Structure formats: C-alpha cells, structure tokens
Design a protein around this ligand. Structure first.
Ligand code: NDP
Ligand code: UMP
Ligand code: RJ6
Lengths: 326, 221
C-alpha cells in the first residue's frame, strides 16, 4: 500500500520550515549523531533531549546574565533491572554523589561533613557571600539550612541550626515511605517531598529535585523523580545516577527488585557555555551501561556506607569540561 | 564501472566480543575505545559460560529470512552472474576450529545452510549435512548456485580477519559483552575509515552481565 503515504504529506502542511526551526547550531557538526539509523541505547534519551533543546530551545538569560536555551517538560525512563544508567559519553565519578545521598539519609544539613570527605558539591552554596545574598545573615557558614536531609527526616519541625538534634520532631517521611512500601505496596501516596513551601527562604537554595513517588508491582519497585530546574550539561548526568542508586537502596531494604527509574524534567535548560562541549558529546557513541551492586547484608536504609556500593564494568569516553574555559 | 560482491551476495558477519584481560593498567586511567571489546574465544571455546540473550539474538538474526524480498535478491544475483530468472534459509559460514567447538547436539545449525572452511578436512570427514570449501573463492561460487536469503560469517578470528581484509563484509552485527574474561583469540581491529557504526540497541543484562548489540556498515567515502 502507498495511498496513505500521500495523506501524510497533507497533514504536515503547517509544520514550520527548518530555517524557522529556531537555532542553527549547524547540525553538520553532528555528523555521527545524525548518521545513526537506530538509536535505541537508553543514553539517547538524554542525548536526544540535548539535541532537542539545542535545535528548538528558547533563548533566555537568567538573573545573572548567563544565557541558556530552555524547554519545558521532558520524561526519561531507565530499566534499572537491566543496567545502571551512568552516562558513557563522558567520564563521571560517583563517590561524591553517594556521600551526598548518605548525608541526606542521615538528615544532615552540615556542609562541613561533606567538605571533610573532600566532596565540594555544596561548598559554593554555603559561603558567607552566598548566604548573605540569600538574606541568611544569621546563618553560619556551611549551615545549608532546612534542605533535603532535614525535610526527609523532619519535615514540619522548626529549623534552628545544623548541630541541633531534631529527634522526634517533624515528619520522618523516609521512614514512612519505607513502611508504606512494605505493608501497603499498592498505596498511591508513597511520595517523598523536599519542597517544603514554608522553609524555602531558609534553605541555601530551594530543592531542584521536588519529589519522588514510588510504585510497587509483583515484587518490583519503580520510582518517579520530578525536577523543577535541570542543568542538562552538568547536573542531570549526576541526578540520574543519584536517584537510580537511591531506588536500589529503597528496593533492597524493602525486599524488592529495582524496576524503573522515571525522570520528569520541568524547566530543562542548556547553558550557552556548554554548547561546544555538548556537540562533542552527541557525536560519541554510547558504550553498554555498567552495573550497580549493593552490599546485600544492609537491611535498613540508615545502615549504608560508602564501601557498600560498587560500580562494575564502567566503560566510558574521555572526561569532558562542559566549560572549556581557561 | 563495477558492482560489489558483498552487496550482491549479501555477505555479513556476526560476532560477540568481551573485554580483554589486560591486567597491566586494567583499572585506573585506561583509555577506552571500540577495540576494548575484542575477546572472541579462549582455548577453543567461548570466554564466558553462557549468555543466553546473545544466543537468542544470534539465532534470530542468522535464521530470519524475508521470503517476500528474495526475488528482488534473486534478480540481482542472477543479473550479476549474467543469468536469468524447501523453505528459504540463510547461509552460515564457519572456520574448522569454529565448527569443532560446537556441541554435537547442535551441529549442524538448525534451519541454516551450514558451510565450513577447511584445508585439512574434506567432505568425507563429515557425517553432517554441510558444505565443505577450501578457498574463499569457492564460497562465492557456492553462493551463485544456492537459493538463500543472507550469508553470515559466523567466525573464527582467522575467518573474520580474511573476510574483512577482502572487504567481503557488508555489515557487522557486533555484540558487546560488558565483562572481562580470559581470551587467546581476538576479533580483528576494525578500521574506522572502512566501517562505521549506524545502530546501537537497547542495553540488557543476561547471566550477570550487561550487553548491547551494534551494527557496523561498510563505508563508501
Ligand atoms: N565470540 C564469537 O562471536 C566467536 C568466537 N569464536 C571463537 O574463536 C575461536 C576459533 O577461531 P580461530 O582459531 O581463529 O579459528 P577459525 O574458526 O577461524 O578456523 C580457522 C580454520 O578454518 C579454516 N580456514 C580459515 N580460512 C580458510 C581458507 N581461506 N581456506 C581454507 N580453510 C580456511 C582452516 O582449517 P584447517 O585448519 O582444517 O585447514 C583454519 O585453520 C574459538 O575459540 C571459537 O570459540 C569463533 C567465532 C565467533
Ligand atoms: O543536582 C543538581 C543541582 C543543581 N542543578 C542546577 C539547576 C539550575 O541550573 C541551577 C539552580 O538554579 P535555580 O533553578 O534554583 O534558580 O542548578 C542541576 O541540574 N542538578
Ligand atoms: C564460540 O564459537 C561460536 C560463536 C558463535 N557466535 C557468533 N558468531 N556470534 C554471536 N554469538 N553473536 C557462533 C558459533 O557457531 C555457529 C560458534
């Protein structure tokens, strides 16, 4: 049949021209990327979004002056039962993000803890200058306020300082969702929310990862994470790893097998500064994903330690500086 | 003016490669590239015990035929050779060492036209329903006489090497086993200016290892 192959052209009579596409970016630079016929490797869910933003993104400058290309609403899915989605088109390290995760799970909000472990993820957000500009004049350096950790274990309590013992204060969401998963797996209220509207102005900065919702079917656990702001070039790669790892942890302590990890992106953006580097990346062919192994003896969400995690068979391309600035 | 033997007889190669055990700097700051996956076999057999998903994939590709496309292919071949117009099967070619490494209960490969390359052995040395050839030329000869869908070079490092050097491969179905094993035979290094990846599949886990399938296509310029 070939009659309907004609109707197709008609229905596409209003679609814009690819000069009015938006951004030129010149996609001749994407030699390899555009040559690939079938791109079924899960890494392409990330790469395709970067291509979509570069080609169709909206130009915007922030409150700083830095420019970005942005889009609104994207969704990615990774089958954790078949692999660990750690990008291969560029080198990534996970020691830092795992420590951050354990830091969250402990309910910590003390930046010094991470810095003592040589993890600088939150260093810039805990400076005198940064805190003062957030109007947090009465906040101690590196005291990030009521962020993730605090909200996960004490949502609702009044934040005082990073050294306080908030035991039995506020709602321990983490505990609650672990119990809902064990006893009431069909529940549709298994959510972990970091966006505490009341504490927003008290945090070094509002959470980028709003919430996590869980789903349980036939002994398998899936997770949806909603991100309000997503820096495609630098953050997302790490964010995908963090929550994938977290879903593994929650699954294990609940006697379940890891299924899907779903990443919903609200405001997705690419920094103009990362464009040259992202172009380089999109032309690299992904390698098969590695695997993630958790010490099977851990049975409580709070008992995990850095050496309980092992990333095996991580094959990847050369490291890339999204900035290339010197 | 000319037509290529690989396009006419649709000769393809299919393989599975793991990562090689190069203990020296096998961790740290080692550079990776498509040549990381090159382990073909170890001691006359596979480096790994059994990766069922690769077998299922191997079987699907080498046994699948599209009868509604044969005539298109027949015309082409008969045209090239300057000629005229049971169930259709694919042809699988393997080196002698490759053949003996197969468990008796699985020889010859079901639903496929089995062809074996050998000098030391002759038809009389085989009991199975298979073709025995002693030159790469005889394959071309045989292909011009048989009714088949596609021809797959199942392998042996030696067999792979000589078919690629002769550019008789139209595409390479390469399974990337993302795990390290001990190996004594390796897949030839693929020249990037001659073959380029055009497709990469989803990633899967099977028998304790992740893996994916990719396709290399012979370039023109
Ligand atoms: N992972 C994978 O996808 C694959 C792995 N393998 C592994 O590779 C190893 C086998 O490879 P290797 O040792 O290189 O052997 P091969 O399977 O390539 O067999 C080589 C032998 O085939 C014959 N042969 C090859 N070319 C010709 C020719 N042009 N004319 C006549 N005879 C020819 C010869 O037989 P004779 O000596 O009788 O003259 C020769 O010594 C095994 O360990 C097997 O398990 C093999 C295929 C695929
Ligand atoms: O893990 C992280 C942390 C931060 N960001 C990015 C998102 C924004 O680009 C910037 C924060 O800006 P606001 O959206 O808060 O204004 O940091 C990520 O993508 N991932
Ligand atoms: C170790 O010996 C063999 C490997 C393969 N496999 C392949 N050629 N490719 C693949 N497994 N994808 C096929 C064989 O005989 C028919 C033998």
């Amino acid at each position: 049949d070939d009659e309907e192959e004609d109707d197709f052209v008609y229905f596409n009579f209003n679609k814009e021209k690819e000069e009015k596409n938006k951004n030129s970016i010149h996609p001749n630079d994407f030699q390899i990327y555009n040559s690939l016929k079938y791109k079924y490797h899960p890494e392409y869910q990330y790469l395709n979004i970067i291509y979509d933003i570069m080609m169709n993104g909206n130009k915007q400058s922030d409150r700083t002056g830095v420019g970005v290309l942005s889009k609104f609403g994207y969704i990615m899915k990774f089958d954790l039962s078949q692999y660990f989605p750690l990008l291969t088109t560029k080198k990534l390290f996970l020691r830092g993000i795992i420590e951050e995760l354990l830091w969250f799970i402990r309910g910590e909000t003390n930046g010094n803890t991470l810095l003592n472990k040589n993890v600088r993820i939150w260093e810039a957000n805990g400076t005198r200058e940064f805190l003062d500009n957030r109007k947090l004049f009465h906040r101690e350096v590196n005291d990030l306020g009521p962020i993730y950790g605090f909200q996960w274990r004490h949502f609702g309590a009044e934040y005082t300082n990073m050294y306080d013992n908030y035991e039995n204060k506020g709602v321990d969401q983490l505990k609650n969702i672990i119990n809902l998963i064990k006893n009431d797996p069909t529940s549709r209220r298994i959510l972990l929310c970091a966006w505490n509207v009341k504490d927003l102005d008290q945090m070094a900065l509002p959470p980028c990862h709003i919430l996590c919702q869980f789903y349980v079917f036939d002994g398998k656990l899936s997770c949806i994470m909603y991100q309000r702001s997503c820096d495609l070039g630098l953050g997302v790669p790490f964010n995908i790893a963090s929550y994938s790892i977290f879903t593994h942890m929650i699954a294990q302590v609940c006697n379940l097998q890891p299924a899907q990890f779903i990443h919903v992106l609200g405001n997705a953006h690419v920094y103009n500064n990362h464009i040259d580097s992202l172009k380089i990346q999109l032309n690299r062919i992904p390698y098969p994903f590695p695997t993630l192994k958790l010490n099977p003896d851990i049975k409580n969400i709070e008992d995990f330690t850095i050496s309980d995690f092992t990333i095996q068979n991580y094959v990847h391309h050369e490291k890339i500086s999204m900035d290339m600035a010197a | 003016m000319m037509e290529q033997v690989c396009d006419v007889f649709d000769i393809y190669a299919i393989c599975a490669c793991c990562k090689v055990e190069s203990k020296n700097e096998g961790k740290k700051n080692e550079v990776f590239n498509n040549y990381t996956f090159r382990g073909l076999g170890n001691k006359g057999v596979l480096p790994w015990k059994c990766i069922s998903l690769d077998m299922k994939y191997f079987r699907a590709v080498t046994t699948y035929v599209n009868e509604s496309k044969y005539e298109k292919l027949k015309y082409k071949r008969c045209k090239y050779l300057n000629k005229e117009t049971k169930k259709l099967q694919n042809v699988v070619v393997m080196g002698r060492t490759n053949w003996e490494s197969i468990p008796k209960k699985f020889k010859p490969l079901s639903n496929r036209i089995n062809v074996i390359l050998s000098r030391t052995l002759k038809k009389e040395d085989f009991d199975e329903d298979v073709y025995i050839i002693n030159k790469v030329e005889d394959l071309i000869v045989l292909l011009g006489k048989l009714n088949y869908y596609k021809c797959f070079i199942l392998g042996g490092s030696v067999v792979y090497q000589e078919f690629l050097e002769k550019k008789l491969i139209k595409k390479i179905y390469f399974t990337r086993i993302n795990s390290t094993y001990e190996c004594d035979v390796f897949f030839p290094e693929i020249n990037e200016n001659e073959y380029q990846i055009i497709s990469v599949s989803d990633v899967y886990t099977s028998n304790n290892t992740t893996l994916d399938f990719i396709i290399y296509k012979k370039t023109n310029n």
